[PDB]
Design an enzyme around this catalytic site. Sequence first.
Site, PDB file in Angstrom:
ATOM      1  N   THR A  62       0.721  -1.117  -0.036  1.00 48.06           N
ATOM      2  CA  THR A  62       0.028   0.016  -0.008  1.00 48.06           C
ATOM      3  C   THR A  62       0.676   1.132  -0.080  1.00 48.06           C
ATOM      4  O   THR A  62       1.798   1.236   0.687  1.00 48.06           O
ATOM      5  CB  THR A  62      -0.754  -0.185   1.314  1.00 48.06           C
ATOM      6  OG1 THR A  62      -2.015  -1.089   1.021  1.00 48.06           O
ATOM      7  CG2 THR A  62      -1.737   1.179   1.638  1.00 48.06           C
ATOM      8  N   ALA A  99      -6.138  -5.236   5.998  1.00 45.41           N
ATOM      9  CA  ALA A  99      -7.290  -4.959   5.412  1.00 45.41           C
ATOM     10  C   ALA A  99      -8.526  -4.981   6.217  1.00 45.41           C
ATOM     11  O   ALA A  99      -9.213  -4.166   6.321  1.00 45.41           O
ATOM     12  CB  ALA A  99      -7.539  -5.701   4.148  1.00 45.41           C
TER      13      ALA A  99
HETATM   14  B1  LIG Z   1      -1.633  -2.342   1.781  1.00 44.29           B
HETATM   15  O1  LIG Z   1      -1.538  -2.173   3.505  1.00 44.29           O
HETATM   16  O2  LIG Z   1      -0.533  -3.081   1.220  1.00 44.29           O
HETATM   17  C1  LIG Z   1      -3.201  -3.127   1.865  1.00 44.29           C
HETATM   18  C2  LIG Z   1      -4.270  -2.220   2.587  1.00 44.29           C
HETATM   19  C3  LIG Z   1      -5.648  -2.842   2.676  1.00 44.29           C
HETATM   20  C4  LIG Z   1      -6.802  -1.988   3.164  1.00 44.29           C
HETATM   21  C5  LIG Z   1      -6.109  -3.768   1.170  1.00 44.29           C
HETATM   22  N1  LIG Z   1      -2.933  -4.223   2.731  1.00 44.29           N
HETATM   23  C6  LIG Z   1      -3.173  -5.546   2.339  1.00 44.29           C
HETATM   24  O3  LIG Z   1      -3.347  -5.886   1.056  1.00 44.29           O
HETATM   25  C7  LIG Z   1      -2.866  -6.580   3.306  1.00 44.29           C
HETATM   26  N2  LIG Z   1      -3.541  -8.030   3.082  1.00 44.29           N
HETATM   27  C8  LIG Z   1      -4.472  -8.426   3.761  1.00 44.29           C
HETATM   28  O4  LIG Z   1      -5.090  -8.004   4.740  1.00 44.29           O
HETATM   29  C9  LIG Z   1      -5.151  -9.961   3.488  1.00 44.29           C
HETATM   30  C10 LIG Z   1      -4.771 -10.724   4.280  1.00 44.29           C
HETATM   31  C11 LIG Z   1      -5.589 -12.073   4.066  1.00 44.29           C
HETATM   32 CL1  LIG Z   1      -5.302 -13.338   5.166  1.00 44.29          CL
HETATM   33  C12 LIG Z   1      -6.002 -12.297   2.802  1.00 44.29           C
HETATM   34  C13 LIG Z   1      -6.153 -11.449   1.941  1.00 44.29           C
HETATM   35  C14 LIG Z   1      -5.657 -10.207   2.270  1.00 44.29           C
HETATM   36 CL2  LIG Z   1      -5.762  -8.767   1.159  1.00 44.29          CL
END
Ligand SMILES: *[B]([O])([O])[C]([C][C]([C])[C])[N]C(=O)[C][N]C(=O)C1=[C]C(Cl)=[C][C]=C1Cl
Lengths: 234, 216, 239, 213, 130, 233, 200, 237, 196
Positions: free
Chosen positions: G1, G49
């Site tokens: 992110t 997320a």
């Molecule tokens: B970013 O910090 O890179 C992004 C922000 C969120 C609001 C989308 N974080 C992520 O993508 C971190 N990933 C997850 O939280 C996650 C965990 C699991 Cl177990 C499965 C899918 C996802 Cl997306």
Amino acid sequence: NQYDNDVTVWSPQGRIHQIEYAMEAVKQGSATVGLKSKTHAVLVALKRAQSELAAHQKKILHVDNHIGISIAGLTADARLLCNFMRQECLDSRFVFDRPLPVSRLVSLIGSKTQIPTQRYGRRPYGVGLLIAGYDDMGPHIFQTCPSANYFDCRAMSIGARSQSARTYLERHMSEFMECNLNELVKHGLRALRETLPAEQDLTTKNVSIGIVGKDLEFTIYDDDDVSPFLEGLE
Amino acid sequence: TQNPMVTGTSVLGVKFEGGVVIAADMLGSYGSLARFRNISRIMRVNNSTMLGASGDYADFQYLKQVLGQMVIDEELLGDGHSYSPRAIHSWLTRAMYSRRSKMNPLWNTMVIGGYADGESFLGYVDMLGVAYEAPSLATGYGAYLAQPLLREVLEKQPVLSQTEARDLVERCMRVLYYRDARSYNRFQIATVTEKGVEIEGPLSTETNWDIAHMIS
Amino acid sequence: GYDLSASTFSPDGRVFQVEYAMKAVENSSTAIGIRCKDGVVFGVEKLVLSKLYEEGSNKRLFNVDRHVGMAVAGLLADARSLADIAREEASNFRSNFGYNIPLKHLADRVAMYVHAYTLYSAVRPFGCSFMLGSYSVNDGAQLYMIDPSGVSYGYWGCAIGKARQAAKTEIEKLQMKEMTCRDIVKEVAKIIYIVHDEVKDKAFELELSWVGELTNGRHEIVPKDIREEAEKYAKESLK
Amino acid sequence: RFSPYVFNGGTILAIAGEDFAIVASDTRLSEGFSIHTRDSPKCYKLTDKTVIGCSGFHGDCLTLTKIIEARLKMYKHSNNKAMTTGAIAAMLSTILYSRRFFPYYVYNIIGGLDEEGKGAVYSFDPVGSYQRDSFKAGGSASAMLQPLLDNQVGFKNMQNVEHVPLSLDRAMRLVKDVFISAAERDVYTGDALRICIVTKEGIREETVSLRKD
Amino acid sequence: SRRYDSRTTIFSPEGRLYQVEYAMEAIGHAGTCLGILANDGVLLAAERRNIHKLLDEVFFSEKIYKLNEDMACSVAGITSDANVLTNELRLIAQRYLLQYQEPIPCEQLVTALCDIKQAYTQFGGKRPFG
Amino acid sequence: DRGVNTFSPEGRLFQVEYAIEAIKLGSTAIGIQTSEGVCLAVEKRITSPLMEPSSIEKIVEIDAHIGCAMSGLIADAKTLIDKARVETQNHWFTYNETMTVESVTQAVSNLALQFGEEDADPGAMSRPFGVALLFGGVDEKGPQLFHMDPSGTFVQCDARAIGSASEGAQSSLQEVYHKSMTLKEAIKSSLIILKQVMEEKLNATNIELATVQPGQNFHMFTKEELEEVIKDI
Amino acid sequence: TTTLAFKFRHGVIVAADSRATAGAYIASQTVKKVIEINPYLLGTMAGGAADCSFWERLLARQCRIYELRNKERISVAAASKLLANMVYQYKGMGLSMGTMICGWDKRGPGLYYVDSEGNRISGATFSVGSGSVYAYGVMDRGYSYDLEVEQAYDLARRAIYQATYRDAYSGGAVNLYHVREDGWIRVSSDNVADLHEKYS
Amino acid sequence: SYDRAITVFSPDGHLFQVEYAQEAVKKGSTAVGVRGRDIVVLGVEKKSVAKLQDERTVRKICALDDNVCMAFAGLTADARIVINRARVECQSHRLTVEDPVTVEYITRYIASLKQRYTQSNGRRPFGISALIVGFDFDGTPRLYQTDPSGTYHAWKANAIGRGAKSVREFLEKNYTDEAIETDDLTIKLVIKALLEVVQSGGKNIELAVMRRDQSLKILNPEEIEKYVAEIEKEKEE
Amino acid sequence: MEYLIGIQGPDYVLVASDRVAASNIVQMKDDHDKMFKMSEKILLLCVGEAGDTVQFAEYIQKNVQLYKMRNGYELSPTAAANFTRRNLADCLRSRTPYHVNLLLAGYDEHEGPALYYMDYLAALAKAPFAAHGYGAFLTLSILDRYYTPTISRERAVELLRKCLEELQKRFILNLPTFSVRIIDKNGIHDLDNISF
Ligand SMILES: *[B]([O])([O])[C]([C][C]([C])[C])[N]C(=O)[C][N]C(=O)C1=[C]C(Cl)=[C][C]=C1Cl
Ligand SMILES: [Cl-]
Ligand SMILES: [Cl-]
Ligand SMILES: [Cl-]
Ligand SMILES: [Cl-]
Ligand SMILES: [Cl-]
Ligand SMILES: [Cl-]
Ligand SMILES: [Cl-]
Ligand SMILES: [Cl-]
Ligand SMILES: [Cl-]
Ligand SMILES: [Cl-]
Ligand SMILES: [Cl-]
Ligand SMILES: [Cl-]
Ligand SMILES: [Cl-]
Ligand SMILES: [Cl-]
Ligand SMILES: [Cl-]
Ligand SMILES: [K+]
Ligand SMILES: [Mg+2]
Ligand SMILES: [Mg+2]
């Protein structure tokens, strides 16, 4: 007098005046009727309206797919008990993946509602219920009371001027088992109509209908949805 | 249970036309020690339902206690409703999941067999609350040694007679005795039909040792 | 006044709230139990308050364990709650000790629970009396009766409710020690018909249950055809 | 160290159309190197308008779908209407997060119709993060299916192609193809493909055979 | 139980708290007790009620209590009640010393005890301290 | 003296009946439901010119689509209003949708008989709430007005008065109401009726008026908007 | 992110990418990382997320209750503090959240960084997430309080873009918002593949 | 723990414990509040006089926080409990919102505390009314009153305690844009309002002022009797 | 990483703190204030773990303010230091320990200036000068070398400057600006920041 304020105080005639008084709450509710055939259980209720511009109180409540109730007495107590019934039904589906048998549910209500009749500072439930259900043992109509006693019924009526409705239901009950649904609902409506002042009639504003059976989940009919059942009271 | 103690090995189950048969040896093992050689690992739950258990035998005995008392409690009411095989299987799924979710499992894998309303019921439940139904089942080493034979027969012929299902269970029990170092050649077969639940035993399989002379 | 609380003795040493609860039992219709050579039979005069009720509604005979029956009189919601106490005590006994609760012990345990409701302003006494009956090869036939004070005794024959004395006087005519359950059911039906006041209360159902050698020590409803024969014997005996 | 989780396999897929939604899953239930049963679908009907797909640890699949079912009835009882697809999705998010510190080991995809009768897909992580998607694959073979869907439904990495609306008959043909491809390469995906089609008329079911090895 | 509850913590119809007033009657009958402030000190002088010939004289006073290094009190009313309150005064004064490592200012000690007395007039259903 | 959960021989809870009498000490409030929205109007009942009229709030926002008018013991209404607010926000949190008017009214009504002195927490409710409430709003059922009293009974009404002059006001409502009435007609009607029943001369500071419409959020009328409507009446 | 925000004469610019990842698997390219708490207040999401979206939704609920109870808009300071106090109880339990709370209140433009470690700080510019270091470089070389509105949009867009280029965990689209005195507006959504075309 | 229901309804909707608590307020010393243009003033009667009293120890005017203060009439021990609860709460607010409370917030908090003690088992209501004054963040001056029922309103001016009826009558005829055009006239309006009911005027009026930002000043007897003479000699004319 | 310093002269206490809030490899704020006003003549300077530092400092602040409102006068520096200590020690073995290091500076009408040092374990020591952070390792010996008990306030600001210049020269962290305040008989005074 000294015996009539506490549900823990037996009178010298072996009565509990608080339980009797709570039963008065049910006798002053608006009438409702329950009856059954071999295949369906029906509830019919009169809805009392506070003014000409008010909707008409809900009298029939959904418990589970196979169970509904009709209420007379304190509405808030009706909701508390209905919420307990809902939760017992959800629990039995969660644990056993099958509907809670109607008579087991009614035993639960009996046991729940008995408890505050024996403890100081508590009070009976001020509500009577007619319970319509369908399970492996067929259709059921049960009645519950503020005394915590309950009854398995061929048909029943509770509330104001319900004695007329009971008399009608005794008079025609040998017919009920073999009735089709339409016949059975009509019988419920005619019994209920006996409770009314001679002037007044069943209308789509004041009648509510609940039906459950072999082919039919518990369903409530109000307002325009009762018109089919009211037509051809012929 | 954190650490199982006396344990039982495979339980087998197969549906047939008009019923279900389950099989389990009569052994409680304590590690590699064949300690208790005459214990039943099958329970008649009620007239329509039977249960076989692998894993910790004390945990099984607790489940027997609890489930037996639940069936008594229901029979006291005499009201025309009984727990189906499916309901019992559901209850067990919940009980096992719940114990798993407290990090204190009942250390068992079970096979529920039943017959109700013209339908054969066969269902699995494990210590984690994994549960499902199938035309045949086999826990433990049974999953590797018995289930392939069961499923191969069932593919060629999905509807088995009672005597075919029984012959097929005997063949699987023989293989298990050959190849599972925690098996024992003393078993029970339990059957549920329209008529109720019957438990037979103690039974043994014939074995062949001809291959002992085919090394040179 | 001295009669408002189960935690208040009167000046003559009475507990009037317990005595008032007993009156609730004495207003109720009659239940009887008879112990005999090979078991125990219960009968109840079950008054039908409306023809709109189903046959079997408001049972007064309960199974509290597979080997134990209960017959009640008095306030029915209190009796059912006591049936559930008895059920739980039987269940917990089996779980803890690993065998079926002996009748006398079950009677004494539920009696002590009843007695606990006769000491306090915080709760009211149960408005019910009940009999407990069982049979086993080891213990024979046993019939106990518990009242709202929590007293528990064993009996050859027993009656509770409003025609209690009329019932007892008929029960005393039987040599119940030398009779079987099949003979006794007829006599139970007979006695209920004798003490029923057909002028004052119009309609009743006879309710019958038994436990004995003939049921293999299981408490069971008397089968429909035996009950009908017993009623017919009682009715013609009334002649 | 008792482990409270095990992986039981399963692949789920949903596609939103203009007036339909597809939810599909294979029917194999696995553990370790074994198959538990060949007939365990991963899709569950919630309302006439909403289907949910669930894969991962089967013990949690079962529990969570039972909790959803109870909560749908509770909602209906207190609000006097069936839960919408969107409200089911928002609710599921909170049920998942309630276990933030002992998660449901489940991948969820909801497919259904929104309140204007359009196809709607919501995809979830195990602790309840979600959003609306046009399509989504989940479970064991998700990495195998998702790129093909990106390309063929999303039109990604293509020049000189008209971005037409997705018909039911092309979506169906896609769903069968991607599962067949997944059953070639994912050991967990196999036996049979179950497809639920949600439209205004109701929910219908097709089943397609897949490889058994 | 409502029949036996004498309702010690309720208002009367003129906005009065009768138990409080009745307690003040008990105090008015106890030994006279005066306090006088000067420029170089303060004093307490109290009537002794313990005056029978056969009493043994074992403590340093009858009704004068040391509370902490810088404070003392005297009392008029029910003696046993006074023993409870003075014990609570000493505790409060030591809780403050523990926490701040300086002696409790006089008015803060008095206020802290008075909040306990107030609570007994408002909730709990108990008789106040006499 | 008897306990708070004692039934009378007619089958009513004394405390609830007495709570219902306390509603009659309240100022008059009116609610009218039309196909174009609901309006809520209430008499302020100013007791001194030194009082600030805008500190009297007998109509409050529950959420953007729901207002509430109250009468009776106003201090008691605060925990009810707060509970309605919290419930609608919980429902939004959980379900990402607005809660229906009926459902808000139900949630509040489940508090009503939760009083008593020997089941409950160390100092739980000792008595019922001396309050009646009109909930007026718009949800997917369209505009809606619900009434609730201390018994916990609640019901939809096309028009309803509560408080001191509610008989009287309710008669006039029977007289003027019709299902096809516009919102502007309902506003005028409710002010005409308040004007009859109020002891004081009606003006733009001693009443409040609010509306909710399918278009538009909960809206409290400003002084200037009240003055405009007052001209015709 | 990658998320960023900055105060300037004309309010506060808020920007984010749209990628979610599960390990190295790209789970979405279309995540909305800017949450609309009310019409005058935005929150941004970086970290877990589920954690961000739960706790920011809960913040939205509490801000609304606050507004109903007190009859005024919550301040940016008070909103950010509500969030900080809610997450503080959970320190050590593995929550992962890095948020910017962005508004305009009675003290003018407002911007606070709040995270699951317990930090809460006011400031002029912030960037958060795995791409933040890349965004800081570009944002810092171009930032001024007296940026014109369109120059400010250009800077935010370019900073996120450059972060998406270096950081494997940032990508998708750049989503850009402007908090003004009468409310926030959504200003644009540009796919990174389209921005690449344009910036060369 | 004691769970008796103390405040209950009576026939016709009365809450007798609350009415009795209001009687206690009426027997309290008179308190008066006036909201000026850029000042707020509290003044209070008596209560007992008595040469041997330490005057400092019995004030009926109290700071809740730097920008809010209060007077009360009624049971003084009860008031002390309310005041300390309100003081704790002002510090929670500053903690969680990092603004000082508004006068309305803290009034609303006090009122709902009072309401709860009319509807909770085991407790009697508080026998006090409070006049709460100060300024909001934006400079607006404020005067609120709470009573034992938990009802609260804002006022331009008001009195509570014994003789509140007549003191309110006086304020109604005398509170005008002229009478509060300045600080001195606002202060004088309070003294005149007290001097109507105050037994051996006066002598025993306590008085305090709050200016926008400048925090609570209590006036000393020398500063008060300056205003007293300056008003008494004007009323000759 | 955070730096606090205090120097107590005959009738004042001078304090300073860095103005960096950092995270991973970036300074995220360059005008951060680590001082909390407890009362007219008391500053608490608080560093340590994120979240624990503000939560702890503000709790103490609000309770010191409460004491003033209840009693009409303020806690002395010493009483405030002991109150701070009791809370920190009482939480040390609890479910909610606070990982904070502190200086408390104050002026009392009767005792004069005071500087108190506390670590996270809640050991409390009165000192004529003191410092916290890794920066303390490079500056305490400069203070031992040049401090005298009668140091004037102008020379204390010079001595402070020598310490801060030593951090610029020798410390691995980029701490370019510091908050400076003095407490005396007339309360708390903001001085100009010392920046580089
Ligand atoms: B970013 O910090 O890179 C992004 C922000 C969120 C609001 C989308 N974080 C992520 O993508 C971190 N990933 C997850 O939280 C996650 C965990 C699991 Cl177990 C499965 C899918 C996802 Cl997306
Ligand atoms: Cl009714
Ligand atoms: Cl009611
Ligand atoms: Cl009854
Ligand atoms: Cl009736
Ligand atoms: Cl053995
Ligand atoms: Cl068995
Ligand atoms: Cl008897
Ligand atoms: Cl000491
Ligand atoms: Cl000391
Ligand atoms: Cl009314
Ligand atoms: Cl996007
Ligand atoms: Cl809030
Ligand atoms: Cl900051
Ligand atoms: Cl409180
Ligand atoms: Cl007053
Ligand atoms: K495969
Ligand atoms: Mg294979
Ligand atoms: Mg910690």
